[PDB]
Enzyme design. Sequence first.
Site, PDB file in Angstrom:
ATOM      1  N   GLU A   1      39.327  16.540  27.632  1.00 11.57           N
ATOM      2  CA  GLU A   1      38.882  17.822  28.167  1.00 11.57           C
ATOM      3  C   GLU A   1      37.592  18.289  27.506  1.00 11.57           C
ATOM      4  O   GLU A   1      36.741  18.889  28.172  1.00 11.57           O
ATOM      5  CB  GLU A   1      39.981  18.871  28.005  1.00 11.57           C
ATOM      6  CG  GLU A   1      41.265  18.537  28.746  1.00 11.57           C
ATOM      7  CD  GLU A   1      41.050  18.346  30.235  1.00 11.57           C
ATOM      8  OE1 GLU A   1      40.223  19.076  30.820  1.00 11.57           O
ATOM      9  OE2 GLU A   1      41.708  17.461  30.822  1.00 11.57           O
TER      10      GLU A   1
ATOM     11  N   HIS B   1      48.038  12.424  46.824  1.00 14.35           N
ATOM     12  CA  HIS B   1      46.641  12.445  47.246  1.00 14.35           C
ATOM     13  C   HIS B   1      46.507  12.228  48.748  1.00 14.35           C
ATOM     14  O   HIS B   1      45.620  12.803  49.389  1.00 14.35           O
ATOM     15  CB  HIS B   1      45.847  11.388  46.479  1.00 14.35           C
ATOM     16  CG  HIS B   1      45.821  11.609  44.999  1.00 14.35           C
ATOM     17  ND1 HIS B   1      46.908  11.360  44.190  1.00 14.35           N
ATOM     18  CD2 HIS B   1      44.840  12.062  44.183  1.00 14.35           C
ATOM     19  CE1 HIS B   1      46.598  11.647  42.938  1.00 14.35           C
ATOM     20  NE2 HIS B   1      45.348  12.076  42.906  1.00 14.35           N
TER      21      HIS B   1
END
Lengths: 594, 195
Positions: A357, A487
Amino acid sequence: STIEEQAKTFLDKFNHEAEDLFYQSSLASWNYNTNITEENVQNMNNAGDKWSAFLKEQSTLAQMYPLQEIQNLTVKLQLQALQQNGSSVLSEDKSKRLNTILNTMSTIYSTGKVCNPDNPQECLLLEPGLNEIMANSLDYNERLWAWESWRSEVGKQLRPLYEEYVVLKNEMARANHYEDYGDYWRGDYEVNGVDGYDYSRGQLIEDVEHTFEEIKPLYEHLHAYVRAKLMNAYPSYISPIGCLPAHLLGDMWGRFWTNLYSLTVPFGQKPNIDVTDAMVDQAWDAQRIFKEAEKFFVSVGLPNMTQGFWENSMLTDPGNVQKAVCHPTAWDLGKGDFRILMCTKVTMDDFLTAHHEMGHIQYDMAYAAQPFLLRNGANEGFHEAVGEIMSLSAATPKHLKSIGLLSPDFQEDNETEINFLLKQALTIVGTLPFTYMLEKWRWMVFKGEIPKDQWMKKWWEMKREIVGVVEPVPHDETYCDPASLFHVSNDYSFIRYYTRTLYQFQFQEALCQAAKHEGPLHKCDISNSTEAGQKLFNMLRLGKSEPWTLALENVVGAKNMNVRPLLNYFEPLFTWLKDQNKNSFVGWSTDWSP
Amino acid sequence: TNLCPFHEVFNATTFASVYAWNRTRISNCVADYSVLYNFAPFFAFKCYGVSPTKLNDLCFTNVYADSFVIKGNEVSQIAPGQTGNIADYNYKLPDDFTGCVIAWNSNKLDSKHSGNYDYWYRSLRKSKLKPFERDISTEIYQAGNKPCKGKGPNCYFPLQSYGFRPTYGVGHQPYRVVVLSFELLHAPATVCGPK
């Protein structure tokens, strides 16, 4: 005045207004994700509505600027990003129907829960249910039942909507001057007007196939090893020459083979490196983890974290008093506001996730000087690759010994390296054939190669031929395996994962050559290397202002996806798997029990 | 001893926009430049054509204090020879500017939740401003060839709002800038440093 100056003025006005409106929307979304309340939901909805209305109004005004009369490449890219009509090119009824179908598929995937046939009152949802079941259970019958029920209940219901979704998306893409939805998805890789760096949408398929042809031997050896391990674990259910069953892949869909590490461990007598106990003993918290990550990123020469980052970010779970979505995400609210939302606890996995991150945040901070429409990664996989290379550099035993987590007398034996490489392989190489097959199936369905009556048949055929997965239950045409994926059911691209997988190892090879690393590639640490940091920042600051091929040439010296760095990374594991499978059969036959 | 109104300029409640910067005339007073250091969190203290230590020795006729609010990134544009939206269309310093530029972070005063849209800057203009020129015109900028009447295609309002918020980055936070221009004209030096 010329059209170019008018376009520049329009782009300046659009950027000025869009910065403020996107900051408002992102702040509302952050307030929602950090404190789940009805008022925050309403505020986020209002901000998103305002942002969407602004984008719709500005897209109509950008239509008056012809792209042919613009010579500046940056202005042309911004206008191309603005002139995209999207779902507004269709009629109102078709757009409403498409939105309703999308929301219905999302709700079916999210609200879908499986109930036991013996006990109709005993029902289990997806995440704490079937995922935890297929994750750790070793029962053939239970895993088979779960795998069949998940696509017999949720399946056979999305396909009647998925076909209309495909039809509407094809109509929308053809209205937007594309061949089909596959071309609309591959348009992110399209480069025009730059001599030597151009890239067509059809070339992406050729490059992906060329890379998978070279991946084929390593994945074949890994598949043979996993098949031998599963046959040693599951007797009378695995064939030494056939494909692997779908439900025994350690996952609901077979994407990641990480859960099979308990059975496919080369040397179980020595546990892998886990610095969780060391961090617990040294009393490390989330602040310490993020400070270590910041020091790692400063050692390569990247700027340190801003004060607003440490002030406004949620690095720890706020407790029961506040409801928050504990999904690690990097937040770029714009105008200098960078935040991280992560429920960090004492875990090496959380250490690597914090490094990932922070790499995302560094990428976001790098291209902050770029225009608003260009404040994104040069490709849909660049952010993920930048995060993954930092996650790799952090997980090296050398870095752990440097930061004081591993003992200074700890010796790195060959077997620990082999176990680490096998785990990284099950994580990374295992999902490449699955991603390739899924994306190719979606592309050929959008192109019309499989119009109506061969979807499931050709899906299973391609799966057997590529991934080596056989069906444990013969599914007919009414079932729909791809719709079971998140997805695919939520209208997201999938080749991004293949591209980021390749770019990760390419960037790793480039930075380890820039850091002058001697030895295997998995032992490489880019710490205290300002050359690699500057070479990476040269790409991170570009964004979408320049084609991704130019950035890839700036980093690794190549204008296309090169799979050779991945093979160099896994060469020791490949050499070991060769000797392991020397006394075993290699390959899989496409004919087995239905 | 007659102290200058520097306190009224630096410690003012609300400041002016960069396209409408308030120029205050300092004359017939003792310029105690040491009181300026009372605002310790100074982001920048850069003097051009004069030294801050030798500033209390020199006498000047008129001292012009130009005060406005800009963002952190645009503080660099307040200097001789700079190019940008502020240095060309809002506030331009000459190539031979004799004075000092003082700026400090005002995220506590000028920032506000839901946006502080009370500060504006000029992004569009027909030509670059002359040194020390002020333009408060709100005529819609004609970017296209068609005549200008009402906002719409190629007709943009020349002023843009900052919208300061406390959670902004250091580069986008509001910074109060005071430009002290020291003029030595053919007149008795009414402004001098403390003796």
